[PDB]
Design a binder for these strands. Structure first.
Ligand SMILES: [Mg+2]
Ligand SMILES: [Mg+2]
Ligand SMILES: [Mg+2]
Ligand SMILES: [Mg+2]
Ligand SMILES: [Mg+2]
Ligand SMILES: [Mg+2]
Ligand SMILES: [Mg+2]
Ligand SMILES: [Mg+2]
Ligand SMILES: [Mg+2]
Ligand SMILES: [Mg+2]
Ligand SMILES: [Mg+2]
Ligand SMILES: [Mg+2]
Ligand SMILES: [Mg+2]
Ligand SMILES: [Mg+2]
Ligand SMILES: [Mg+2]
Ligand SMILES: [Mg+2]
Ligand SMILES: [Mg+2]
Ligand SMILES: [Mg+2]
Ligand SMILES: [Mg+2]
Ligand SMILES: [Mg+2]
Ligand SMILES: [Mg+2]
Ligand SMILES: [Mg+2]
Ligand SMILES: [Mg+2]
Ligand SMILES: [Mg+2]
Ligand SMILES: [Zn+2]
Lengths: 138, 208, 150, 234
RNA sequence: CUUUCU
RNA sequence: CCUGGUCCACCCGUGACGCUGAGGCGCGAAAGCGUGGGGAGCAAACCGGAUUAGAUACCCGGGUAGUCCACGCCCUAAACGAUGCGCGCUAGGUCUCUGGGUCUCCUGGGGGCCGAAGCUAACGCGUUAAGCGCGCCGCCUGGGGAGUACGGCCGCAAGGC
RNA sequence: UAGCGCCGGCCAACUCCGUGCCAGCAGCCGCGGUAAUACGGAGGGCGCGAGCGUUACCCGGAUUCACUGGGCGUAAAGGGCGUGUAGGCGGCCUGGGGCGUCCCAUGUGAAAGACCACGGCUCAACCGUGGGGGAGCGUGGGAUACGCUCAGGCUAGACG
């Protein structure tokens, strides 16, 4: 079975971006879509849209990259240099609003899932709440 | 107790010139005047590239040997500046500069740091009246630092306060040569002091 | 302008019927303490020659360090081979907390306050490269912002 | 300088073992071979050629690189048809990268052509008088186009990048813009200004280059007449 | 073929 | 004759019924053990020839257990891909085995080789991962002492764990 | 009154003499078999200083039991394979619950110690006063994204 959907997605994204795919599909789920929403907002992806692959619902995730580079290996700088699951089944990770980490001295973000929806860390901190520490991204 | 022993040898080992004597240390004799090399049988041999350690060790030895202080005290003073808010490098110097024996010296009451220590010890000093003979007493802002009335007649205190006529004083100080008084206005800042020291190193040395 | 710290010089040897045949290698760091650091590893028949070649190679391999008030914009952990270097930014008066190798680079880098840690293989040469590499990846909220514009 | 009906030549090339990365520039297969999409070949031509005027109308140099026998001649032609230098026979390792060195070679060439006219023309055993003949022979066999370059080029026009992989790599290490008429069998990503189309065939190579050489002059106040290289297209 | 040690 | 696994096409049925798996139970090369049978060739041990300084060996001639069958036991191994299982994801090229197709190519299952990205100490691995991830089991923590001692459990014994 | 340790490298501090794989040093690597900065003394030096050095033990260095933070093709490390119990883990949509989880208030979290401030003893050590922090748990109120649970639905896993 597909043991962990949220990881499965971050990974697909991680994998696609690593070989510079333009778009990339992932089996859709409300929760997954919600995360991408932040992904798009924080400007980590061009964005995404609901599509239908072989009859079943997916989510194209339009990737984004830095510009072409100089000298050897003109491969673009990543926009998503990092992205890691944190809470994982059989090892859930919950944090109090006071225990919310500051990803990459603020240059990166962490996506929490709270009873107030799935906000980022600044959003959560602002709203004074905590929750499952889904993943960091920078 | 404090070092006590040939002092200009430190002057020489530390390369830099240290004023651990006041007079003479200005006369063509601080030895750093034609002999800026370390003491001992090897003074003049080539110097091998010092190790990261060496450097830090030396820098500390320098600063410390200046205010003539036991590593014991020096260290604790450091560990204190460490805890206190504010750039440690500064805070630390500010604290060394707050020792009574230092101020007595920074106020021209004494020719050197050593001498000022003795003045403090032999009770020739005042701190807002009450005499204080603890050379490691922390002089703080507002404190007036007089001279023992009884001692005010002492030739030394006279000669010293005499030549003090004219000489300016640190911007964190101020002295009334008349009544032989002086006030500790504020903790001197790093910029205020011109010590031949790289305290960033001294910090790093206690990092190890 | 460019200061020059020499990390390590080693002797090493090759074999030939008839004897061992050494050649030295020297790791050199070069920086202006402004924000430009350069690492070079040069080898050659005699120590001097090696050191020189190294400086040469170093100057030809510079990195732009985002020094922000003596420190670095954020934590980095770079693994070069079995060597892993860790860089944490620190406030004023902290000083440079790092091993002889990472330090020597960080210093000519113009870095004044950082927390450091060498994990894994502690091979100067590989740790050195790790350090350099870590610096190469340092970014600013500016760049980060720039990259996530559009 | 242009045209869209360049279907007259270039377009599709290379059986089918391509280089997945050249996927974009491909239109489809036919009887087995891929088909380079020319409309794109166009979009690229513009962009590329533009970059060339810039470089050209600036007095900038461009090292033409063509080892591929299928263009070995066209490269001399066009390159000579402009004060431009070229590497025609073998691309020596480090021409770009170890320039100050390979230069010493172009020095020797000159320093020799001298003796073979000087008072010493006939001096020392004809043996040396022969070894020196050789000295030049080869010196001139590879440094006839690389002759010019007094300093590192400001760019490089490579025939087939794959075949010329080394030339490219070097330039890149030196951040020397890379231009190239490349197709199916190559890594487009290593090319700065690409001309996706038949890496092989003279009828193709001849066109693109010549037009590109014209464009150079048609941007240097020379406004020269038709190319003497169309002759090598039979 | 076998054909030890230093 | 009896019977297991497995793959493809159609997409027809059920509707998360799934994955991993401490124990348990079972299977488990060879040699070995027990009872009975068999025994051509081969062949530990053994009996001889030769070689050698010696030859308890290699070479030559014989030769018993055994190798074979049955029923029961033993349970180990370089039991190896020295690489636990499942799922998703990340260029291709080439050869091959088997199925389907509109069958000079596409497509599914499997076996190989070269390889993108990436990983790796290196060697190498690279959609048959040693890459990117998640789930569950097992296992490692300097060498020798030592797979030994002691204890326990299993075995007829050898011996195993 | 000034002593004690050290000066081959880790590690700050180098020379002469004596000895000759001896006598000895030694934490590890090692040093000593006639030019020893490594033994013994001396001169000189480095570091601490009424202390200095040793031994012992604990934490550190040791991401070397790795939660933070490690690994198992050839370095130590995949179980000989399967079937499978407990246990761990669980696709998409919706609804109820609100156990986990998050939030607020409140009680508790003694004093001492730790932290900050000011103060007392000539300073400090020591001590006094005041202030702030504090996981955990109790009670009440709230949230529901995720996990759990219950119910309903689905076909993309699985089975047929
Ligand atoms: Mg590693
Ligand atoms: Mg069958
Ligand atoms: Mg159906
Ligand atoms: Mg139904
Ligand atoms: Mg058997
Ligand atoms: Mg039997
Ligand atoms: Mg026989
Ligand atoms: Mg026989
Ligand atoms: Mg068996
Ligand atoms: Mg296959
Ligand atoms: Mg590669
Ligand atoms: Mg391979
Ligand atoms: Mg042991
Ligand atoms: Mg028994
Ligand atoms: Mg030393
Ligand atoms: Mg001797
Ligand atoms: Mg530990
Ligand atoms: Mg761990
Ligand atoms: Mg390990
Ligand atoms: Mg092993
Ligand atoms: Mg196995
Ligand atoms: Mg679920
Ligand atoms: Mg609740
Ligand atoms: Mg007080
Ligand atoms: Zn002096």
């Amino acid at each position: 079975m597909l043991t962990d959907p949220i990881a499965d997605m971050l990974t697909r994204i991680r994998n696609a971006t690593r070989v510079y795919k333009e778009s990339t599909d992932v089996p859709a789920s409300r929760f997954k879509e919600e995360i991408l929403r932040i992904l798009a907002r924080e400007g980590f992806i061009k964005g995404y849209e609901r599509v239908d692959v072989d009859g079943k619902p997916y989510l194209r995730v339009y990737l984004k990259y830095g510009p072409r580079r100089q000298g050897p290996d003109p491969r673009p700088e990543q926009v998503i240099h990092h992205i890691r699951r944190i809470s994982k089944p059989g090892r859930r990770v919950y944090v109090g609003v006071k225990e919310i980490p500051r990803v990459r001295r603020g240059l990166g973000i962490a996506i929490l899932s709270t009873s107030k929806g799935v906000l980022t860390d600044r959003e959560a901190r602002k709203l004074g709440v905590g929750g499952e520490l889904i993943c960091e991204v920078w | 107790g404090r070092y006590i022993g040939p002092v200009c040898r430190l002057c020489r080992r530390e390369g830099v010139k240290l004023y651990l004597k006041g007079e003479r240390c200005y006369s063509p004799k601080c030895a750093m005047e034609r002999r800026p090399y370390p003491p001992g049988q090897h003074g003049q041999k080539r110097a091998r590239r010092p190790s990261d350690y060496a450097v830090r060790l030396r820098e500390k030895q320098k600063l410390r040997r200046i205010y003539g202080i036991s590593e014991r005290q020096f260290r604790n003073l450091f560990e204190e500046a460490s805890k206190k808010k504010g750039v440690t490098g500064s805070v630390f110097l500010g604290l060394l500069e707050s020792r009574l024996d230092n101020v007595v010296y920074r106020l021209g009451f004494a020719v050197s740091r050593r001498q000022a220590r003795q003045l403090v010890r032999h009770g020739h000093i005042t701190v807002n009246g009450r005499r204080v003979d603890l050379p490691s007493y922390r002089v703080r802002p507002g404190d007036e630092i007089a001279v023992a009335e009884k001692s005010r007649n002492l030739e030394l205190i006279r000669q010293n306060l005499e030549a003090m006529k004219g000489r300016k004083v640190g911007p964190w100080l101020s002295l009334d040569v008349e009544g032989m008084k002086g006030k500790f206005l504020r903790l001197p800042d790093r910029e205020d002091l011109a010590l031949p020291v790289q305290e960033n190193l001294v910090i790093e040395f206690y990092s190890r | 302008d460019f200061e020059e710290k020499m990390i390590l010089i080693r002797r090493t040897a090759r074999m030939q019927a008839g004897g061992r045949r050494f050649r030295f290698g020297a790791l050199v760091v070069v920086g202006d303490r402004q924000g430009r650091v350069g690492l070079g590893f040069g080898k050659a028949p005699e120590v001097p020659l090696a050191v020189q070649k190294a400086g040469y190679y170093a100057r030809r391999n510079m990195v732009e360090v985002p020094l922000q008030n003596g420190t670095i914009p954020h934590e980095i952990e770079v693994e070069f081979g079995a060597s892993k270097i860790v860089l944490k930014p620190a406030a004023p008066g902290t000083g440079v907390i790092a091993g002889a190798v990472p330090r020597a680079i960080l210093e000519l880098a113009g870095v004044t306050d950082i927390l450091t840690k060498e994990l894994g293989s502690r091979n100067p040469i590989n740790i050195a490269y790790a350090t350099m590499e870590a610096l190469r990846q340092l970014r600013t909220k500016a760049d980060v912002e720039r990259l996530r514009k559009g | 300088v242009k045209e869209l009906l360049e279907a007259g030549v270039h377009f599709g090339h290379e059986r089918k073992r391509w280089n997945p990365k050249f996927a974009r520039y491909i239109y489809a297969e036919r009887n087995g071979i891929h088909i380079i999409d020319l409309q794109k070949t166009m979009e690229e031509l513009e962009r590329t050629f533009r970059f060339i005027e810039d470089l050209a109308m600036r007095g900038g140099t461009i090292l033409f690189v063509g080892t591929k026998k299928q263009a070995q001649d066209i490269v001399r032609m066009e390159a000579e048809r402009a004060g431009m230098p070229y590497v025609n026979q073998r691309w020596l390792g480090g021409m770009l990268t170890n320039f100050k060195t390979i230069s010493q070679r172009v020095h020797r060439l000159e320093e020799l052509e001298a003796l073979f006219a000087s008072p010493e023309i006939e001096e020392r055993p004809k043996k040396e008088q022969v070894r020196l003949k050789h000295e030049l022979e080869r010196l001139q066999k590879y440094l006839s186009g690389f002759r010019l370059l007094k300093r590192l080029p400001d760019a490089i026009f490579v025939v087939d990048p794959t075949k010329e992989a080394i030339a490219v790599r070097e330039a890149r290490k030196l951040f020397i813009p890379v231009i190239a008429l490349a197709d199916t069998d190559s890594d487009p990503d290593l090319v700065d200004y690409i001309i996706p189309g038949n890496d092989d065939a003279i009828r193709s190579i001849q066109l693109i280059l010549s037009r590109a050489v014209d464009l150079i002059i048609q941007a240097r106040g020379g406004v020269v007449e038709p190319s003497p290289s169309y002759a090598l297209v039979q």
